[PDB]
Amino acid sequence: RENHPYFDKPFRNFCRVVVRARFNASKTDPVTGAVKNTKYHQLYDLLGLVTYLDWVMIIVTICSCISMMFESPFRRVMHAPTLQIAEYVFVIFMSIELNLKIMADGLFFTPTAVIRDFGGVMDIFIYLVSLIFLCWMPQNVPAESGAQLLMVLRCLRPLRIFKLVPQMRKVVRELFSGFKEIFLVSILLLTLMLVFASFGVQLFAGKLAKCNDPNIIRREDCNGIFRINVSVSKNLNLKLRPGEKKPGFWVPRVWANPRNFNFDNVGNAMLALFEVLSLKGWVEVRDVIIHRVGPIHGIYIHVFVFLGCMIGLTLFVGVVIANFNENKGTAL
Amino acid sequence: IALLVLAQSVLLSVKWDVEDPVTVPLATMSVVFTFIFVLEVTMKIIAMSPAGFWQSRRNRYDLLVTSLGVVWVVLHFALLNAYTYMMGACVIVFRFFSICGKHVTLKMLLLTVVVSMYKSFFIIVGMFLLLLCYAFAGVVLFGTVKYGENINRHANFSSAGKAITVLFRIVTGEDWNKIMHDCMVQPPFCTPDEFTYWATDCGNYAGALMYFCSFYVIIAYIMLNLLVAIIVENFSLFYSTEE
Amino acid sequence: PLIMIRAFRIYFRFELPRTRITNILKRSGEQIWSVSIFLLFFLLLYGILGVQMFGTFTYHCVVNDTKPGNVTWNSLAIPDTHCSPELEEGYQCPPGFKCMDLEDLGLSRQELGYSGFNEIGTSIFTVYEAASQEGWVFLMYRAIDSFPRWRSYFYFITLIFFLAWLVKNVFIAVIIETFAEIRVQFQQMWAPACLQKMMRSSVFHMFILSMVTVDVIVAASNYYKGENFRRQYDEFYLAEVAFTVLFDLEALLKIWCLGFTGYISSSLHKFELLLVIGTTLHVYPDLYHSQFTYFQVLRVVRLIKISPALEDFVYKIFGPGKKLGSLVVFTASLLIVMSAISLQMFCFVEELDRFTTFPRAFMSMFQILTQEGWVDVMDQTLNAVGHMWAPVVAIYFILYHLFATLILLSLFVAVILDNLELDEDLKKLKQLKQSKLPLRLR
Amino acid sequence: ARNWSRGAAGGDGQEVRSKHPTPLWNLSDFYLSFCNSYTLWELFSGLSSPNTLNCSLDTTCRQCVEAYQDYDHHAQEKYEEFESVLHKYLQSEEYSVKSCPEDCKIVYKAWLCSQYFEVTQFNCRKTIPCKQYCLEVQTRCPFILPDNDEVIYGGLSSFICTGLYETFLTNDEPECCDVRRE
Numbered sequence A: 001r002e003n004h005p006y007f008d009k010p011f012r013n014f015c016r017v018v019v020r021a022r023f024n025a026s027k028t029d030p031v032t033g034a035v036k037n038t039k040y041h042q043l044y045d046l047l048g049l050v051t052y053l054d055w056v057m058i059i060v061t062i063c064s065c066i067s068m069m070f071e072s073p074f075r076r077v078m079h080a081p082t083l084q085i086a087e088y089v090f091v092i093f094m095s096i097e098l099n100l101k102i103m104a105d106g107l108f109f110t111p112t113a114v115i116r117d118f119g120g121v122m123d124i125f126i127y128l129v130s131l132i133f134l135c136w137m138p139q140n141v142p143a144e145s146g147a148q149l150l151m152v153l154r155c156l157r158p159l160r161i162f163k164l165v166p167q168m169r170k171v172v173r174e175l176f177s178g179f180k181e182i183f184l185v186s187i188l189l190l191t192l193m194l195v196f197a198s199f200g201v202q203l204f205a206g207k208l209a210k211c212n213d214p215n216i217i218r219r220e221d222c223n224g225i226f227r228i229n230v231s232v233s234k235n236l237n238l239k240l241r242p243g244e245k246k247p248g249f250w251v252p253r254v255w256a257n258p259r260n261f262n263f264d265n266v267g268n269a270m271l272a273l274f275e276v277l278s279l280k281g282w283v284e285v286r287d288v289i290i291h292r293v294g295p296i297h298g299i300y301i302h303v304f305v306f307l308g309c310m311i312g313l314t315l316f317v318g319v320v321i322a323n324f325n326e327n328k329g330t331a332l
Numbered sequence B: 001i002a003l004l005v006l007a008q009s010v011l012l013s014v015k016w017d018v019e020d021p022v023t024v025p026l027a028t029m030s031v032v033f034t035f036i037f038v039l040e041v042t043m044k045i046i047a048m049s050p051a052g053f054w055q056s057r058r059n060r061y062d063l064l065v066t067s068l069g070v071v072w073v074v075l076h077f078a079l080l081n082a083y084t085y086m087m088g089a090c091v092i093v094f095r096f097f098s099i100c101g102k103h104v105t106l107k108m109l110l111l112t113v114v115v116s117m118y119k120s121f122f123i124i125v126g127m128f129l130l131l132l133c134y135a136f137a138g139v140v141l142f143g144t145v146k147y148g149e150n151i152n153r154h155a156n157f158s159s160a161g162k163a164i165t166v167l168f169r170i171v172t173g174e175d176w177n178k179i180m181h182d183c184m185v186q187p188p189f190c191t192p193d194e195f196t197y198w199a200t201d202c203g204n205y206a207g208a209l210m211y212f213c214s215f216y217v218i219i220a221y222i223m224l225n226l227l228v229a230i231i232v233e234n235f236s237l238f239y240s241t242e243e
Numbered sequence C: 001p002l003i004m005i006r007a008f009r010i011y012f013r014f015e016l017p018r019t020r021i022t023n024i025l026k027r028s029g030e031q032i033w034s035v036s037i038f039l040l041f042f043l044l045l046y047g048i049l050g051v052q053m054f055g056t057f058t059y060h061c062v063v064n065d066t067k068p069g070n071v072t073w074n075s076l077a078i079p080d081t082h083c084s085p086e087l088e089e090g091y092q093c094p095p096g097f098k099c100m101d102l103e104d105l106g107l108s109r110q111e112l113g114y115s116g117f118n119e120i121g122t123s124i125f126t127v128y129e130a131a132s133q134e135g136w137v138f139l140m141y142r143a144i145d146s147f148p149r150w151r152s153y154f155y156f157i158t159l160i161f162f163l164a165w166l167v168k169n170v171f172i173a174v175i176i177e178t179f180a181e182i183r184v185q186f187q188q189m190w191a192p193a194c195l196q197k198m199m200r201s202s203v204f205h206m207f208i209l210s211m212v213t214v215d216v217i218v219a220a221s222n223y224y225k226g227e228n229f230r231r232q233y234d235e236f237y238l239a240e241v242a243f244t245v246l247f248d249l250e251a252l253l254k255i256w257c258l259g260f261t262g263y264i265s266s267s268l269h270k271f272e273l274l275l276v277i278g279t280t281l282h283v284y285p286d287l288y289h290s291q292f293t294y295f296q297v298l299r300v301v302r303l304i305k306i307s308p309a310l311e312d313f314v315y316k317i318f319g320p321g322k323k324l325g326s327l328v329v330f331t332a333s334l335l336i337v338m339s340a341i342s343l344q345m346f347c348f349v350e351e352l353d354r355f356t357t358f359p360r361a362f363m364s365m366f367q368i369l370t371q372e373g374w375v376d377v378m379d380q381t382l383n384a385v386g387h388m389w390a391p392v393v394a395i396y397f398i399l400y401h402l403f404a405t406l407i408l409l410s411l412f413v414a415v416i417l418d419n420l421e422l423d424e425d426l427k428k429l430k431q432l433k434q435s436k437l438p439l440r441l442r
Numbered sequence D: 001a002r003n004w005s006r007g008a009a010g011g012d013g014q015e016v017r018s019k020h021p022t023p024l025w026n027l028s029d030f031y032l033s034f035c036n037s038y039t040l041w042e043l044f045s046g047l048s049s050p051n052t053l054n055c056s057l058d059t060t061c062r063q064c065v066e067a068y069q070d071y072d073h074h075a076q077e078k079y080e081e082f083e084s085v086l087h088k089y090l091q092s093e094e095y096s097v098k099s100c101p102e103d104c105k106i107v108y109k110a111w112l113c114s115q116y117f118e119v120t121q122f123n124c125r126k127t128i129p130c131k132q133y134c135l136e137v138q139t140r141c142p143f144i145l146p147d148n149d150e151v152i153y154g155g156l157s158s159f160i161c162t163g164l165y166e167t168f169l170t171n172d173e174p175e176c177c178d179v180r181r182e
Helices: A014-019 A041-047 A052-070 A085-104 A118-134 A148-153 A166-175 A181-203 A266-277 A282-293 A298-311 A313-328 B004-012 B024-045 B050-055 B057-076 B082-096 B105-119 B123-140 B160-170 B176-180 B207-219 B223-233 C002-008 C018-053 C120-129 C137-143 C149-162 C170-187 C203-218 C238-257 C269-282 C294-305 C308-318 C325-345 C358-369 C376-385 C391-406 C408-420 C426-433 C437-441 D040-046 D053-057 D060-087 D101-112 D132-140
Strands: A225-229 A248-252
Touching (some): A052 A085, A085 A118, A166 B123, A181 A313, A248 D060, A266 A282, A266 A298, A282 A298, A282 C358, B004 B082, B004 C018, B024 B057, B050 B057, B057 B082, B082 C018, B105 C018, B123 B223, B160 B176, B223 C170, C002 C325, C018 C149, C018 C170, C120 C391, C170 C408, C203 C238, C203 C294, C238 C269, C294 C308, C325 C358, C325 C391, C358 C391, D040 D053, D060 D101, D101 D132
Antiparallel strands (some): A225 A248
């Protein structure tokens, strides 16, 4: 209560009445007042797990989402009178609750405040961004400057539903409960990532390139416009007539690496390893490294994924079920 | 009765039309089977009390199935359109849904499903809401996509209901690689942008490296096993064999 | 090749009797039977609901000029859409290209894939194809623009919410409970002076750690730099030989000053001697960047001495050595078994390609193993095997796929739950034994 | 002179049809039907491998004129196949709201007349790099990956013209007329 000269920043009655509106969860009889073994309880419990002002904040967030669902790149927000009521009402009712909060007690110097972790700081950061996006209004911004980092944090909205709902608050406490445990597990997965990225850049550097047209085999001859067929249907197994050619068109010959993956630098080899770390899209790269660079090279990727997806993915899904025994109460 | 409820469900072998001359005598045969069934249900409700027939779940569910079957029979003989056979397919599905009264172990695993679906109000709406917000962030930068076979006209970055469906695809773990590798579009594969990120179509080079790991490494490795653990904690409590 | 199981006679004998073995196998067999008939009952439910839900998937939008005598893809478009004659169902493409049926144009039920919802067994195979967890883009991309919005999207969200995310995972709970029964039965079972100044100080360990980190950052820093390289005298090679002979002289100092009897008792110093041999042989020219390049990249495991927390987690991920190395040995064994039986059954019928080397059958059973696409192999065999001889080898592949993938990986996650829980004796000792804000305030 | 968007006989030049246009012409004004954008006489003046004006100087030119129309037909085969492939497409225009398939085809054929006919020619009335045309294709056409049957392709599309170590104006800037809308 002491050690603050700027304490209780500017009556002190009205806001504290309207914020601690303690609505009853279970209405009782006027005789004894016991627990409720009756049918109609889940509606009145869904009604009142928060306050009424917090109910209006949850309602305006959900209606802003379902109105802001029909955003599109050619259906704008900042130009028309129809959709600006989201930003207006959102900013104005945030200013109402925040003026109520700073008139009431303060910002952080009180222990009654919500700010001990993510909640208060994330509220005030979303409010700074939304205040300076209601005031800015540019009608032409390109993809070249970093103020759109602002505009990519403009839609991090539902990390605030995790603040007001206590159940959502406790499951996002669970969601960062083992975040240090899985930081160490991510260090182990990063060491596997680093050793195979070093393996990739230690053997395969610049070797995955070859002629796009299979027939030609030498780079000296890698010049001209060859004829490339175009994929029609993978699943059909139609047999081509003897005197007919598959659809295609004429394209230049190039000695180019595959787009999705390559192992020349540590970053793109790390991207290849990461993309095979989810266990999908992998027989393409397996048959590439068997077909083209050697029959002795793909077995290293075989033993790597046989160690990775069975000792790192399983260490993930095991230390988290161990942590779910810890926090939901089946540990000791 | 346990073999008759399986002999009723095998008449859905053919997609039901109004031209196939072998599904109308089998429709008449299933009309005779539902007549035998409603005869047995009437003798069962004259066998025991209607009050205990109302207090129990499976009895009044079967009574609802027989009422929908008899109104199906009288409306097929009154209207003769395809909507009669559609609601007949619906009551046949409700008849196959009346499998509850004979086995004990499948019920324990449907009760496992029931407490999976009722109790888990936590992380299903978390996943829906995060795929919704990531749909918004796909709109606020990556909203105009170049086309391939992956990014087709069926799930692209245009509308955020359609981008709910794109996220809803990318969370499933299959081929999110060349999904992410359809929109990293930089010169010399792009038009020179000066003042506007909407008029032209462009892709990020390093903000996508930030963004798609920021989406995938935090939920799309650890929260599906939390749903697995939901089915685990519904399993060890309700399932039992001989002890 | 089942003769190699004859070589496993010494370890098929156990410390506990056979009555507990037969009891756990009979109750887990009842468990897998009951949960698998739950699966097949929901499988028949989704089969009849897909036969009622969907129709004959031959209704493409290909131009009406199609030559029946010369049926070929050339006429058909590359990003082909499908139009169904029924109103407000299949999306219609711009005019000039009308839509006609393809099954009536002279094609049978075999050449147009094996997916579909016409009959019972095709819909069974289709619903079992959509549980692959990969490439279910196929059927939904067929069904979005053939059937209208809520029918298709409701059936596909209930399929993905039920079949792929709930009943894939009840077998994980099954095998978790059978290892819980294994847990309760296993509970029911029971100058030398440099040794005084360099081995005791902490400057040498951080010195060799910084050496290891600058080694692993100098070996991976070489990207393309054109196509001009000569491995006899070049950067990142003479430094590598210099650090190699530095490590060799350091290991000779460790073996001379400490001894030999204090070197074998550690579990990683034999690995360090093998490291020394491997880095000695790799820096020869003939074996530089060759097949024996195993022993250069794995120097990152030396970095384990940064934090003790990761070391005790490694000690808790390992435990004893008869539960996690025996499992990778027996997965290797059954992998060799099933690749040998597939190599023996599919080299006399001659209707399957990719059969040059034992690598190719290894890759075949590996792609069966690894939750990926395994219907293209049967799509390339069973259209040439025959008409009346298809479903038996189909359900043989089904049984092989299911006894290798849906159980074995859940055996891995259940045994990692056995590894990551504590022991059933320290739990009771901790049960009977139980009987920042200072910085903020500052 | 008059550009060849129109005109039959009063357009400073004649449309070649047979071996009739040039027995002995000191000055040639003849344009073509197929790739009219590229002028014939300056083509002869710059690079003309089969036969050229100087070669005759020290009927040869009409002989290679017939070969030129045949080469044009070959170019027509390339252009015709590309248009046909686009015909059997349903994402021809919808692929992007900015770029257009018409511009994609015009720059496609422009590059077809740039690295099949490698000629530097004056009178274009504009100075723009020639090899850049392929890069132009890379910016106006969507990704159409080819069939992986012969060789597995890791997401490498078929329309792409450049890549690693390709002739994308590497230390050379040939000048020729460009034809585009925007």
